[PDB]
Design an enzyme around this catalytic site. Structure first.
Site, PDB file in Angstrom:
ATOM      1  N   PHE A  16      -3.089 -14.776  53.423  1.00  0.00           N
ATOM      2  CA  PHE A  16      -4.149 -14.014  54.099  1.00  0.00           C
ATOM      3  C   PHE A  16      -5.552 -14.244  53.525  1.00  0.00           C
ATOM      4  O   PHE A  16      -6.457 -13.439  53.798  1.00  0.00           O
ATOM      5  CB  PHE A  16      -3.788 -12.527  54.037  1.00  0.00           C
ATOM      6  CG  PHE A  16      -2.465 -12.264  54.740  1.00  0.00           C
ATOM      7  CD1 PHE A  16      -2.334 -12.478  56.114  1.00  0.00           C
ATOM      8  CD2 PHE A  16      -1.357 -11.814  54.028  1.00  0.00           C
ATOM      9  CE1 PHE A  16      -1.115 -12.256  56.761  1.00  0.00           C
ATOM     10  CE2 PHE A  16      -0.131 -11.585  54.684  1.00  0.00           C
ATOM     11  CZ  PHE A  16      -0.024 -11.809  56.043  1.00  0.00           C
ATOM     12  N   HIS A  63       5.758 -14.556  45.584  1.00  0.00           N
ATOM     13  CA  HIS A  63       5.284 -15.915  45.247  1.00  0.00           C
ATOM     14  C   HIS A  63       5.601 -16.962  46.286  1.00  0.00           C
ATOM     15  O   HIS A  63       5.037 -18.057  46.232  1.00  0.00           O
ATOM     16  CB  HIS A  63       5.881 -16.399  43.922  1.00  0.00           C
ATOM     17  CG  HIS A  63       5.521 -15.566  42.739  1.00  0.00           C
ATOM     18  ND1 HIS A  63       4.203 -15.331  42.388  1.00  0.00           N
ATOM     19  CD2 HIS A  63       6.327 -14.956  41.839  1.00  0.00           C
ATOM     20  CE1 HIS A  63       4.247 -14.569  41.305  1.00  0.00           C
ATOM     21  NE2 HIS A  63       5.515 -14.317  40.943  1.00  0.00           N
ATOM     22  N   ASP A 104       3.310  -5.535  40.439  1.00  0.00           N
ATOM     23  CA  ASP A 104       4.154  -6.429  39.643  1.00  0.00           C
ATOM     24  C   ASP A 104       3.236  -6.967  38.491  1.00  0.00           C
ATOM     25  O   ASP A 104       2.013  -7.089  38.681  1.00  0.00           O
ATOM     26  CB  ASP A 104       4.480  -7.617  40.535  1.00  0.00           C
ATOM     27  CG  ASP A 104       5.591  -8.488  40.018  1.00  0.00           C
ATOM     28  OD1 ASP A 104       5.322  -9.324  39.170  1.00  0.00           O
ATOM     29  OD2 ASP A 104       6.740  -8.341  40.509  1.00  0.00           O
TER      30      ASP A 104
HETATM   31  C1  LIG Z   1       9.988 -11.572  41.661  1.00  0.00           C
HETATM   32  C2  LIG Z   1       8.491 -11.707  41.417  1.00  0.00           C
HETATM   33  C3  LIG Z   1       8.085 -12.119  39.979  1.00  0.00           C
HETATM   34  O1  LIG Z   1       6.645 -12.165  39.996  1.00  0.00           O
HETATM   35  O2  LIG Z   1       8.519 -11.134  39.063  1.00  0.00           O
HETATM   36  C4  LIG Z   1       8.636 -13.516  39.593  1.00  0.00           C
HETATM   37  C5  LIG Z   1       8.272 -14.038  38.203  1.00  0.00           C
HETATM   38  C6  LIG Z   1       8.420 -15.545  38.155  1.00  0.00           C
HETATM   39  C7  LIG Z   1       8.111 -16.061  36.761  1.00  0.00           C
HETATM   40  C8  LIG Z   1       8.269 -17.566  36.752  1.00  0.00           C
HETATM   41  C9  LIG Z   1       7.988 -18.219  35.404  1.00  0.00           C
HETATM   42  N1  LIG Z   1       7.950 -19.641  35.664  1.00  0.00           N
HETATM   43  C10 LIG Z   1       7.228 -20.512  34.885  1.00  0.00           C
HETATM   44  O3  LIG Z   1       6.580 -20.143  33.917  1.00  0.00           O
HETATM   45  C11 LIG Z   1       7.429 -21.932  35.444  1.00  0.00           C
HETATM   46  C12 LIG Z   1       7.415 -23.163  34.550  1.00  0.00           C
HETATM   47  N2  LIG Z   1       6.219 -23.639  35.242  1.00  0.00           N
HETATM   48  C13 LIG Z   1       6.513 -24.949  35.826  1.00  0.00           C
HETATM   49  C14 LIG Z   1       6.364 -22.623  36.284  1.00  0.00           C
HETATM   50  C15 LIG Z   1       9.077 -17.897  34.460  1.00  0.00           C
HETATM   51  N3  LIG Z   1       9.016 -16.996  33.507  1.00  0.00           N
HETATM   52  C16 LIG Z   1      10.253 -17.015  32.919  1.00  0.00           C
HETATM   53  C17 LIG Z   1      11.100 -17.923  33.522  1.00  0.00           C
HETATM   54  C18 LIG Z   1      12.498 -18.278  33.254  1.00  0.00           C
HETATM   55  C19 LIG Z   1      13.191 -19.092  34.139  1.00  0.00           C
HETATM   56  C20 LIG Z   1      14.514 -19.425  33.896  1.00  0.00           C
HETATM   57  C21 LIG Z   1      15.204 -20.224  34.789  1.00  0.00           C
HETATM   58  C22 LIG Z   1      16.529 -20.557  34.562  1.00  0.00           C
HETATM   59  C23 LIG Z   1      17.145 -20.067  33.422  1.00  0.00           C
HETATM   60  C24 LIG Z   1      16.450 -19.276  32.529  1.00  0.00           C
HETATM   61  C25 LIG Z   1      15.118 -18.942  32.743  1.00  0.00           C
HETATM   62  N4  LIG Z   1      14.469 -18.157  31.868  1.00  0.00           N
HETATM   63  C26 LIG Z   1      13.190 -17.829  32.135  1.00  0.00           C
HETATM   64  O4  LIG Z   1      12.507 -17.002  31.243  1.00  0.00           O
HETATM   65  C27 LIG Z   1      13.322 -16.486  30.193  1.00  0.00           C
HETATM   66  N5  LIG Z   1      10.321 -18.475  34.496  1.00  0.00           N
HETATM   67 CA   LIG Z   2       0.500  -7.818  40.579  1.00  0.00          CA
HETATM   68 CA   LIG Z   3      -7.448 -11.333  52.908  1.00  0.00          CA
HETATM   69 ZN   LIG Z   4       6.779 -10.353  38.275  1.00  0.00          ZN
END
Ligand SMILES: CCC(O)(O)CCCCC[C@H](NC(=O)C1CN(C)C1)c1ncc(-c2cc3ccccc3nc2OC)[nH]1
Ligand SMILES: [Ca+2]
Ligand SMILES: [Ca+2]
Ligand SMILES: [Zn+2]
EC number: 3.5.1.98
Length: 367
Positions: A181, A135, A170
């Site tokens: 890209f 990301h 993922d």
């Molecule tokens: C490594 C590659 C990967 O692709 O796996 C990364 C996944 C990234 C997911 C981000 C997502 N962020 C959003 O929804 C945000 C809100 N908006 C503004 C964007 C997300 N889900 C779940 C969480 C999340 C974040 C937390 C941060 C702190 C403490 C507890 C937390 N508890 C959580 O959840 C229990 N945050």
């Molecule tokens: Ca994917």
């Molecule tokens: Ca491309």
């Molecule tokens: Zn993920």
């Protein structure tokens, strides 16, 4: 036949901590390592400690301002960088933690070192489970990712490879790699992900690239509950068509384990065998391959997944009975390597799967 595998791991990686309650746990990388060492997989592969990627390496993609900020920010000076944190999206999902920059340097170092090893034809496969942070953007952190080790590793591969194929299993859309890209035909990005009321909100099947990159971005949006049968029936046909049409000379496979059944953040229903079948499929093409980590938030299943995928890379059969290891209690109550799917409904009907596959096949005819 069987391939040479080089694996990257720094024994310090498991000590980086995102903070109380944060789902990203670098400790899962150490569990993975300890489990595969206990299976004896170190006897079949070369284990390397990555270097700490420098600012020169990171700015081959990221802006100088964003890397200077990541190098400077610490929990003790956070109060002075309130404005900069907002600008670079450092906060709740992407917190400031002790040793943040060093964690980025090790995660990135493994991916770049693996790409160098592949460019030099010194290995068939390179593995970096601490990488795959798909990301991160040119000047912004996002979704637990700060430095896009994948984009940096691909830029390294592009020094020797005219066409590089990126595949992302993922559960989340690989938006940072696709964005980097988006306007080039030198990298084709293929992401399979949950789409609809789900982070990052991108990856519609209608996002196909732009300019010279039109038709070089492929997105397969999925609903909750996808299972091994449904995933397997679309992955091999899509990847086979992509290989046929695109003819890449190197591949990067992001193996985010949050697409497994029982993931804390994910809503898919794959088993470790269903997820690893993706690695088996990509391996059959016999191209230089960089295998990376990514998400995975039920850490006992991440360790099982990546241990089994390392065994798959090595064409090494390993028993289902888990060997004793430093984290043995984490694998109860069964103490088995393989996992069972849940009874959750698969919202991806067979007709939906075939229809999206057909729509992507129409786009691949345009290459
Ligand atoms: C490594 C590659 C990967 O692709 O796996 C990364 C996944 C990234 C997911 C981000 C997502 N962020 C959003 O929804 C945000 C809100 N908006 C503004 C964007 C997300 N889900 C779940 C969480 C999340 C974040 C937390 C941060 C702190 C403490 C507890 C937390 N508890 C959580 O959840 C229990 N945050
Ligand atoms: Ca994917
Ligand atoms: Ca491309
Ligand atoms: Zn993920």
């Amino acid at each position: 036949g069987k391939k040479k595998v080089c694996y990257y791991y720094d024994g310090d990686i498991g000590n980086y901590y995102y903070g109380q309650g944060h789902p990203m746990k670098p400790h899962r990388i150490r569990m993975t390592h300890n489990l595969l060492l206990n299976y004896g997989l170190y006897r079949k592969m070369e284990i390397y400690r990555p270097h700490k990627a420098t600012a020169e390496e990171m700015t081959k993609y990221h802006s100088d301002e964003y890397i200077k900020f990541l190098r400077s920010i610490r929990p003790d000076n956070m109060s002075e960088y309130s404005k900069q944190m907002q600008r670079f999206n450092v906060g709740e999902d992407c917190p400031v933690f002790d040793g943040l920059f060093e964690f980025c340097q090790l995660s990135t170092g493994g991916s770049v070192a693996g790409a160098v090893k592949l460019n030099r034809q010194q290995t068939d496969m390179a593995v970096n489970w601490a990488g795959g942070l798909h990301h991160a953007k040119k000047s912004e952190a996002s979704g637990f990712c700060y430095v896009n080790d994948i984009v940096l590793a691909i830029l390294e591969l592009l020094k020797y490879h005219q066409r590089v194929l990126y595949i992302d299993i993922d559960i989340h859309h690989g938006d940072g790699v696709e964005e980097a890209f988006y306007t080039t035909d030198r990298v084709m990005t293929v992401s399979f992900h949950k789409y609809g009321e789900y982070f990052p909100g991108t990856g519609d099947l209608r996002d196909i690239g732009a300019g010279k990159g039109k038709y070089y971005a492929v997105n397969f949006p999925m609903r909750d509950g996808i299972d091994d049968e449904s995933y397997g029936q679309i992955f091999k046909p899509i990847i086979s068509k992509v290989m046929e049409m695109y003819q890449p000379s190197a591949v990067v496979l992001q193996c985010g384990a949050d697409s497994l059944s029982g993931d804390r953040l994910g809503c898919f229903n794959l088993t470790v065998k269903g997820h690893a079948k993706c690695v088996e499929v990509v391996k059959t093409f016999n191209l230089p391959l960089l295998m990376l980590g990514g998400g995975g938030y039920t850490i006992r299943n991440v360790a099982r997944c990546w241990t089994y995928e390392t065994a798959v890379a090595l064409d090494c059969e390993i028993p289902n009975e888990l060997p004793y290891n430093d984290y043995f209690e984490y694998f109860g109550p069964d103490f088995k390597l393989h996992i069972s799917p849940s009874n959750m409904t698969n919202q991806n009907t067979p007709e939906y799967m075939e229809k999206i596959k057909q729509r992507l096949f129409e786009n691949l005819r345009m290459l």
